[PDB]
């Protein structure tokens, strides 16, 4: 009865996998405010309260349809389609080490 989206995120410094429900409200500024939170809230988590959490935005985005079994660039209003599954890029600022790990709950840094 309910439709579904994923949202993740690439930075040497956050790595990040959530799950959204949406009820019959399907518009775009939704997936911005989620998506640029989701980074945000792994920054303001890490240091105490009063205290500023930097400034995190969204660089380059693409979709993954998993019917055709193959990447596609993500379309406005009409992003819902057959549930679609997102993952955000951003570039390193230091740690140039290589990592891989990818689990279905949201993950924090050592």
């Known amino acids: 009865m309910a439709f579904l989206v994923q949202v993740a995120a690439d930075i040497f410094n956050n ?4 799950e959204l429900s949406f009820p019959s409200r399907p518009s775009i500024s939704e997936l911005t405010r989620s998506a640029e939170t989701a980074f945000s809230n792994e920054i303001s988590l890490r240091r105490p309260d009063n205290v500023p959490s930097h400034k995190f935005h969204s660089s380059k985005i693409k979709m993954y349809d998993e ?3 193959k990447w596609v660039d993500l379309i406005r209003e009409d992003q ?3 549930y679609c599954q997102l993952y955000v890029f951003q570039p390193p600022n230091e740690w140039h080490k290589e990592s891989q790990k990818e689990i279905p709950p949201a993950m924090k840094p050592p």
């Not at 790595?15 to 959530?18: A, H, L, Q, R, Y």
Request: net charge negative; proline share 0%; hydrophobic share 40%.
């Open 67 to 69: 019917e055709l079994n």
């Open 15 to 18: 790595k990040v996998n959530f």
């Open 80 to 82: 819902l389609t057959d």
